Design a protein around this ligand. Structure first.
Ligand SMILES: Cc1ccc(-c2nc(C)c([C@H](OC(C)(C)C)C(=O)O)c(-c3ccc(Cl)cc3)c2C)cc1C
Ligand SMILES: Cc1ccc(-c2nc(C)c([C@H](OC(C)(C)C)C(=O)O)c(-c3ccc(Cl)cc3)c2C)cc1C
Lengths: 142, 142
């Protein structure tokens, strides 16, 4: 599985929108509570993402997510492509969010606690998702 | 220079607050426009940061930034320590922001364009800051 491929989707919890990106080769996740499920929020998220990792291509389970001109501007500027092709982490992440929920007042706080727990967790014997991404990407530099 | 050390500060531009984190060993940056320069915003930013990189210790040029209980809760939960010890990227980042400013309506957009440009830029002959962090961190896993 290519190191430049990410999957991005939105889920819903407590009336709010959680934008979830998955680095597919590693299982590493970034997520953000966004105020509305719009092109503008997706575009802005993609710019942030791309400044941090070598994002080559992005898949989603809702292709209409990427039709806004604002999103196409962000993938043009950052050099990203979309892919259909001519886990789901959503359940897992929600499970983690439910386990930490009482530890926080705001959903957005519980989401970041859950991302932290997921990325640091030993899938071992065996690295964490956060170790794997960095090693997948370092190796692909070298 | 240790791979777990980050520097965090806020600067001001156009009446707004930009929270800037620097991975000191590599020069890699993450930044976010925040609505107010408060403990709550710093705490939330630190949680996001820590879920993505192995953050061990954080330095700042304004130690009072880390006195709120909300911030101390976030460094306790994530396992972070603060350090006084018993570039500035701020000018550089602002230079980049000024170079891309007209390419965007919102300051927050220009900030992420600038972070992208800074992290991807060849400091070579020579890696980018984004290559260096990942390789510094991968090597420190291994
Ligand atoms: C007296 C007092 C002072 C502060 C807080 C307080 N308030 C808020 C809104 C938050 C979290 O929100 C932020 C935005 C600060 C992360 C949260 O959502 O619970 C947190 C918090 C929760 C988890 C972590 Cl890992 C870090 C900070 C705390 C501790 C609570 C009390 C009772
Ligand atoms: C007809 C039409 C449609 C959309 C936009 C439009 N509007 C906004 C508010 C934004 C940027 O904001 C977001 C939040 C979407 C990134 C910006 O700040 O300029 C962008 C934008 C700017 C730079 C990039 Cl790299 C990506 C998107 C665009 C293209 C402009 C026009 C004239």
């Amino acid at each position: 599985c290519s190191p430049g491929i990410w999957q991005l989707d939105c889920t819903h919890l407590e009336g709010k929108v959680i934008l979830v990106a998955v680095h597919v080769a590693s299982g590493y996740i970034e997520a953000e509570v966004i105020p509305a499920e719009t092109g503008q929020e997706t575009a802005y998220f993609l710019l942030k993402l791309a400044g941090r990792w070598p994002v080559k291509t992005v898949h989603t389970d809702n292709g209409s997510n990427f039709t806004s001109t604002t999103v196409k501007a962000a993938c043009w500027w950052a050099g990203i492509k979309q892919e259909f092709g001519i886990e789901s982490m959503n359940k897992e992440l929600k499970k983690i969010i439910g386990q930490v929920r009482d530890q926080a007042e705001h959903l957005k706080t519980a989401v970041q606690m859950a991302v932290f727990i997921h990325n640091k967790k030993r899938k071992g014997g065996g690295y964490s998702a956060g170790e794997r991404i960095v090693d997948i990407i370092a190796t692909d530099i070298q």
